């Protein structure tokens, strides 16, 4: 049968490469963009936002419907956060310690804590496929002082991850765990992150911390020398990215793995991503445009729908147009992604990034 | 169950409150209908039309057994006839006497509607209210573009009424509602209303407001439209509204209510609470414990605090708008409540005053 987990790649180019992630469930193709996952009304694998689902409707509600396969009808691969990107962007509302951090207690008595040991066993409950350690996303900026203290705290939170892992058969055998590198911009604290997750072992490696408004130029430096600290023979996540032009220069810098809400964020506030740039569709200059949102885009919003009908849809206050600005996002996302794994396979990757960023700065939509 | 039955249990000044009793249940007015979605405490559900026949389409809806299937709702079910999307998108239409033609996609497919389409899309979708096919006039609109306007909708009206009656398993099970035009005239509102009465339906909508007129405006034409419609039949205003503007609503005779506030609300971080609405987003809430409001019975209002959704909603958390939204749902249906019991009591001209007193002061 399938295998738990197995990373191989099938063609490389600089530091970018590509191929396959076998799992139980289905194979995920590599570079990969994961899309976020819904309750069920060309992506390999879907993602479920656990802080979210924790509270509404809960982990075990979640369980005894079946898992997040059953929830969101879905019987390819799963990958779960642990929340530890809530831990920042929701620390006003936290007590933090070595344990773990707790929240503030609801107005119905009800209280929910998150620790290295219970995200785990919330991810086993959800029936992930694929689990994060639970972590620290260090805010930005942050002092070396506080970023040193944050990432270490994380490593300590990542063995505890380890362990809480491996202690149940059902989950260890499988299911596969990620760890995440944190670091914030320091090249030395990136390289002890690194060493930690590598000394514990993992399946994958996620560089966690970033996509937190550093800006592209500061985002791609620290890629530089934090992805190659990782283990090479291991799949390499970046967390919360991002734009069509950030992950064809993360690949360039060896990122196998993906997820972004600009898709879904963007389709729903007026902007759909071409091969020309985004584009603005609330934007005078289309209420006439006869063409689909991108000439050459293959889903199915562009099969039957043109700028102009789209256009007027969000001016008339339909919500029929900002689901069809998402589907064709989330759609255009995989055809980037496919295009990106073609172009490394056949040695022209370098040449594609060259073409891609030219047509897609030049913003000749 | 009788098949339509609207009785009226207590009056005060021309508001009034009762009930509509259908096949599938009652409907409690002044009722607020809101925005059914698909599956995944109001009366009554509403249904987008011209949305459905394009997603997934009005054929594949009735082979999955209808939008009481589609959106996992047994009681009852309104659907608009497109006659909205009619004026706000009407540069994508082609219209004329028979119907308005939709400019054809990039697949070949082109939609259409017309008083017969529309019916038998709304009887597709089995609705148990059918809204007459008609056009919502733009604002602001000449006398001489309304009065077109109002009267190419009457001739609308009636063959509507006509290819509803055409299905026996549609008119002996469900309800047609005729709508009122004239934009904000007087004298094209009475001949709208005259000419609906001699064809007769079960309900009377008053169309073409809530399009950008204002509430002294708004209100103003309500004075003399709603009283030209038949009192012992229901009043629908479409697209009402703002809480307070249901209010003034009810007190000109108005039975029926459709907004998509609530929800766009919900979207933009803005609640409806007893002391007007707030913007949750402001840094005053950052710390504040205390539910969005302190009277609502809601689920979100049970367990989450303002300072919660505040930085829900700071951190991109989608669940803070989906609770925002929750909230105000059940918020408006809590001021229905409040006002069916105060037009029982005979109070309804205080809780009116009291109302707008504390909703205006924002003391929040
Ligand atoms: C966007 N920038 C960005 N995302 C990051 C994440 C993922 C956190 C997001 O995963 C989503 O669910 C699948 C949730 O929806 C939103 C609201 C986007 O937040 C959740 C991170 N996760 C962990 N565990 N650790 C990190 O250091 C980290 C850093 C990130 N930077
Ligand atoms: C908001 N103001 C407003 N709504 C009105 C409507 C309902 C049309 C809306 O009903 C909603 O679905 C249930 C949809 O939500 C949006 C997208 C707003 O449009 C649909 C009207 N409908 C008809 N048939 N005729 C009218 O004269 C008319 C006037 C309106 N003024
Ligand atoms: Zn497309
Ligand atoms: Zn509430």
Same mark, same amino acid.
């Given at each position: ?5 197995? #990373? ?32 069920? *009304? @060309? ?14 409707? @809960? ?5 005894? /419907?079946?898992?997040?396969?059953? #929830? ?7 990958? *779960?956060?642990?929340? !530890? ?16 951090? *707790? ?34 996303? *260090? ?25 809480? #892992? ?19 911009? #320091? ?20 560089? !966690? !911390? ?13 890629? %530089? ?6 283990? %090479? ?12 032009? %950030? ?8 990122? %196998? ?12 506030? @007026? ?41 007027? /849809? ?52």
């Amino acid at each position: 049968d399938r295998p738990r987990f197995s #990373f191989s790649i099938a063609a490389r180019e600089g530091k970018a490469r590509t191929g396959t992630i076998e799992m139980k469930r289905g194979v995920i193709r590599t570079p990969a963009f994961m899309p976020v996952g819904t309750a069920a *009304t @060309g992506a390999d694998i879907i993602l479920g936002n656990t802080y979210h689902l924790m509270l509404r409707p @809960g982990a075990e509600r979640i369980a005894k /419907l079946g898992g997040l396969h059953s #929830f969101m009808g879905w019987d390819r691969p799963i990958l *779960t956060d642990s929340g !530890g990107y809530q831990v920042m962007s929701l620390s006003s509302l936290t007590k933090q310690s070595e344990e773990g951090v *707790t929240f503030k207690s609801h107005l119905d008595g009800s209280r929910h804590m998150l620790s290295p040991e219970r995200s785990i066993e919330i991810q086993h409950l959800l029936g992930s496929d694929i689990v994060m350690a639970f972590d620290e996303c *260090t805010p930005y900026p942050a002092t070396p002082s506080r970023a040193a203290s944050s990432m270490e705290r994380s490593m300590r939170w990542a063995k505890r991850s380890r362990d809480a #892992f491996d202690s149940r058969k059902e989950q260890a055998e499988n299911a596969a765990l990620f760890g995440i590198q944190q670091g914030s911009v #320091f090249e030395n604290l990136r390289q002890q992150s690194a060493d930690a997750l590598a000394e514990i072992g993992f399946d994958g490696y996620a560089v !966690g !911390g970033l996509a937190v408004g550093e800006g592209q130029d500061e985002m791609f430096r620290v890629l %530089d020398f934090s992805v190659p600290m990782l283990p %090479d023979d291991k799949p390499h996540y970046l967390m919360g990215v991002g734009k069509p032009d %950030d992950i064809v220069g993360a690949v360039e810098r060896g990122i %196998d793995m993906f997820d972004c809400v600009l898709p879904t964020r963007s389709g729903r506030n @007026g902007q759909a991503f071409t091969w020309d740039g985004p584009i603005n569709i609330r934007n005078a200059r289309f209420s006439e445009d006869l063409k689909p949102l991108d000439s050459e885009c293959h889903c199915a919003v562009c099969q039957k729908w043109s700028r102009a009908y789209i256009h007027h /849809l969000i001016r008339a206050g339909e919500i029929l147009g900002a689901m069809l600005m998402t589907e064709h996002n989330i759609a255009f996302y995989q055809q980037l992604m496919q295009k990106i794994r073609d172009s490394i396979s056949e040695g022209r990757f370098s040449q594609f990034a060259q073409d891609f960023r030219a047509r897609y700065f030049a913003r000749n939509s």
